Each structure stands twice: as C-alpha cells, then as structure tokens.
C-alpha cells in the first residue's frame, strides 16, 4: 500500500475475541450446576467425559469439564470455574476448579495435587 | 533461599568439580564424579543447544551458590554496566563478600564462608557485615572478628587456601586474618572453563 493510501485509510488491527467470554475477564467465576452428566468425546477419542452445565453469577450458562478421577458434583452444587477448553469436547470452554466451594478434591492423588485440590498427606 | 541438598550430585550433573567440598580429599574418592546422579545417570543423553546453555548457567550458579532470582538480577546489572556483559557478570559474582571470604582462605568452602559471614564473624572496613551478597569495592579490607579469630575452622581453611592457587587481586595476611580486595578480578584471572557467553545468550533467549 502507498503512503497516500495509508494516510487516507490507516492499517487496521484485528478484533482478537476472547475464547472464554463467560468469565468476562475474571480469573474465575462461581456457578450453580444445573446438570451433571457424561458426554462422549469427538473422534478419534473414546471416553465418558464428566461435564456439568453451570449457571454463572453473571447469568451466562456454560458447560464446564470436571477433571480428575471421580467427583461429588450434583445438580445445585456451587462450583468455581476457570478458563480452559477441552479439545475433544465441543462447546466446553471451561474447567471446574477442584477443591473449591462445593467441588471436592480428587481422592488418593499424590502428584499434581495442587491441580486437583488435594491437601498434602 | 539456599540449597541444602547433597553437594556432589551438583558436581556430577555438571560433570566438573564445583569445589563444593573442602578439597582435603579428591572428589573421585568421595563420589563417582564422571557419572551423572540417579538411576539413568550412567547413560549420557545428547544435549540440545538450550541444554548446553542451561547447564553452563546452572554450573556458575552452583559454584557461587546463587538462586535464580538473584542470578537474574546480576545478569541485568551486568548488561546495564558498561563493557562486556559476560565479564561484568563474573566480576559481580567475584565481588560477593561470600566469595571473597572463601578466596581469602577464611572459609574452606563458599558455604562455610557463607556461614561465617551470616554469623557475623566477618568485618568489612572495620564494620560487621552479615550479608553474603554484599559487594566488596576495590581497596576494601575484609577481616575476621577478634572473637572469631580463635575458631579452628578458620585456621584449617587458611591451610587449604595455601594448597590452592592464590588470587592475584586479593592480598591476604594470615595470623592477622585480614585481607584486602586490591582490584576487581580480570577475566584472565578467572577460570577459562566457564563460558559466560552461553549465559548471556541464554538470558537473551
């Protein structure tokens, strides 16, 4: 582009939209589990992945992955969610923070305990 | 805020003696210096360029017993200071009171020198300084406290220092147990084994 063209119309930057809009630029958000269920991943993966539908304090309703082995979440459980999509679960853009609010830490975890809300043995 | 683990493992990982022991006995007798620590230590994996740079930086840190945050600050200061950044960095590490006490022979190891400094056994220019990181200027006089002069460790350390090569930039008087930092060490004065360029490159990564 010529300088004269740029003077008339300057270079324009990209929108750069967020991949975690429900957080609204917050590190975490609290929500209430409307539904807790399992969903199959997209190919080429096979599993029964644990997810919850959550209604956030901001009023957005989103699906959040429940990480680790085993959970105590039920409908009406109050959980904290953080950013983090699950590649093989379409429409799941958030993770549940283990060991926060109603969500319990993973049982019998000895490694990466801080990632699963497990206190030191 | 200090490494309190086994010393020889560090030397084994680096593959060179870091002088983390007194040197009363050879490192080979004390440990298998050649072999890296752990189960898979005998295996020698190929090291990446990043790996080579990391290992050089870790070696220098392990020699002077400096943690990453402080070492990073030294790098930043060395880059800000006029002249060769790599040479400036080594000069800063040499200027530490801890290192100076060891090089003067008051301490058998840098860790021993650290305890002496920390335990208020060392005076700089006639004032007690208990900070390991304290930077010694040229013409400063470093001396043991009169109370600490009687300590057996200090006398033993002085004997070991006689065995070691004497720093040109330091003038030390035994019995008096005082030393003078005549000048900042030149790059030539320091060992050529260290490759400071790798550290500078690593911090530009």
């Amino acid at each position: 582009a010529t300088v004269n063209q740029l003077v008339r119309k300057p270079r324009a930057r990209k929108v750069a939209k967020s991949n975690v809009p429900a957080l609204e630029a917050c590190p975490q958000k609290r929500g209430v589990c409307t539904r807790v269920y399992t969903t199959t991943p997209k190919k080429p993966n096979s599993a029964l992945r644990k997810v919850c539908r959550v209604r956030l304090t901001n009023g957005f309703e989103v699906t959040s992955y429940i990480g680790g082995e085993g959970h105590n979440l039920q409908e009406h459980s109050v959980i904290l969610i953080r950013g983090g999509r699950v590649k093989d679960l379409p429409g799941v853009r958030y993770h549940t923070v283990r060991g926060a609010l109603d969500c319990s830490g993973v049982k019998d975890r000895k490694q990466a305990r801080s990632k699963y809300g497990v206190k030191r043995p | 805020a200090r490494y309190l683990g086994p010393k020889l493992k560090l030397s084994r990982r680096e593959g060179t003696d870091l002088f983390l022991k007194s040197g009363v006995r050879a490192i080979d007798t004390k440990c298998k210096i050649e072999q890296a620590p752990g189960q898979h230590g005998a295996r020698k994996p190929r090291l990446s360029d990043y790996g080579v740079q990391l290992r050089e930086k870790q070696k220098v840190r392990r020699i002077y017993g400096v943690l990453e945050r402080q070492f990073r600050n030294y790098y930043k200061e060395a880059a800000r200071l006029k002249g060769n950044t790599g040479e400036n960095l080594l000069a800063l590490l040499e200027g530490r009171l801890d290192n100076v006490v060891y090089r003067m022979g008051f301490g058998a190891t840098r860790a021993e020198a650290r305890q002496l400094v920390s335990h208020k056994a060392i005076m700089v220019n006639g004032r007690v300084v208990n900070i390991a990181s304290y930077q010694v200027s040229p013409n400063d006089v470093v001396s043991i406290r009169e109370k600490a002069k009687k300590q057996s460790r200090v006398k033993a350390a002085l004997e070991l220092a006689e065995q070691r090569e004497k720093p040109t930039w330091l003038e030390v008087d035994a019995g008096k147990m005082e030393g003078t930092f005549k000048r900042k060490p030149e790059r030539s004065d320091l060992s050529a084994d260290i490759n400071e360029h790798l550290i500078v490159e690593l911090y530009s990564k």
């Binding site: 199959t40 190919k43 096979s46 029964l48 | -």
Partner: protein
C-alpha cells in the same frame, strides 16, 4: 405373597412415576395433573396383579401432589423387592451356550445388576465381541455373540429405543446399533418385546 414383576416392567413403573413427578413439578393445571395421576395409578395396577397395602401406600405417596425424589427412591426400592432377578447360568452351561468359543471367560455380574437385568450382556474387548445371554419366551436360555464396533457414537439403540452411546453390532449384512453398555441398556429397557424384536431382526 408380594406380586412378582419382571425387570422391564419395573423400569416402566419407574418411567411413569418420573412422568407423574415431572407433571407435578412442571404442570400448573390441576386438571392435567389429575389425569396423569389417575393414569399412573392405573398403570401400576396393570403392572401388579395384586395390590398389597405396601403397593397401596406407595401409590398413595405417588397420588399426593407433593411427591418427592426421596419418596420416589423408597417407592422404587419397595418395587425392587417385587422384581425377580435374572437367573445366571452355570459356567458349564454358559460354555455349552457358546461351545465354539474355547475356554470362554464369564465376567462376574453383580446381583443388583442381575436383579434389574432383562438380558445379560458383556463385551470382550480383546476380541471386540459383545456376548448377550437371555431367556426366550419359551424360557430356554439363549446366548448370542457378535462383533461390536470399537467406535462409540450417539444414536438410538435398537434394543431400548433410547438415544444413547451406541456401537454397531454385527452378529457372528447391515449391523444394528445398540448400547455399548448393556447394564445401562437394561435400565433403559421398559419392554421385553423390544429386545425380542431385536433378536428377531438379527435372525
């Protein structure tokens, strides 16, 4: 003597109870609520040849507009007592059922699963086979094994006619999609005829 009900019948009871509870929860009209309530009572009466006081008590709780999930659970547990468990064949008999399979290994089946099992299905993952054992209308034990696809997909299952995680099943030429988990399938199944139709379709 308590009335004896088949597992599929019990699943049907559960469904009608859940419907009535949902009707109480989600319906604001009394007239509609009453019609469902009457229907639910009729269904249970059809399911049980004789209504004992315990059945009547359970019915009464169901009839009450203020039904609760915890109340339902207790009612279901009572109904579970009426349910008759699936008869597991002897290991030798099961070997006879699948003679061609050599040294066939039968997985241990939990009793509560066996209680609610209209049919028993297990998958040999190494062979990628699903084994189904059931008693026909004649009440003779019948066993079928077919290749089950490793892939699990979302679709309606031929046996239970419910949208579920299913895999293509080909008996020993189009396959039939059925639930990969037979235990879940058995819970979903409310009519034994549907399973029988699936067997007939396989032919």
């Amino acid at each position: 003597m308590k009335t004896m009900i088949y597992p599929h019948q019990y699943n049907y009871i559960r469904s009608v109870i859940l419907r009535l509870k949902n009707v109480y929860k989600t319906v604001n009209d009394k007239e509609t609520v009453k019609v469902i309530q009457s229907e639910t009572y009729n269904d249970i009466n059809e399911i049980f040849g004789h209504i004992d006081d315990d059945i009547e008590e359970s019915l009464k709780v169901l009839m009450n507009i203020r039904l609760s999930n915890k109340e339902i659970e207790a009612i279901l547990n009572k109904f579970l007592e009426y349910v008759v468990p699936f008869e597991l064949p002897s290991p030798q008999k099961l070997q006879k059922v699948f003679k061609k399979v050599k040294k066939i290994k039968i997985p241990q089946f939990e009793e509560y699963d066996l209680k609610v099992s209209s049919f028993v299905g297990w998958n040999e993952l190494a062979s990628n086979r699903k084994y189904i054992i059931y008693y026909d209308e004649k009440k003779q034990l019948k066993g079928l094994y077919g290749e089950i696809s490793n892939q699990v997909v979302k679709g309606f299952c031929t046996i239970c006619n419910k949208e579920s995680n299913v895999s293509l099943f080909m008996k020993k030429k189009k396959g039939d999609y059925i639930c990969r988990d037979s235990i879940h399938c058995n819970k979903q199944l409310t009519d034994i005829n549907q399973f029988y139709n699936f067997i007939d379709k396989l032919d």
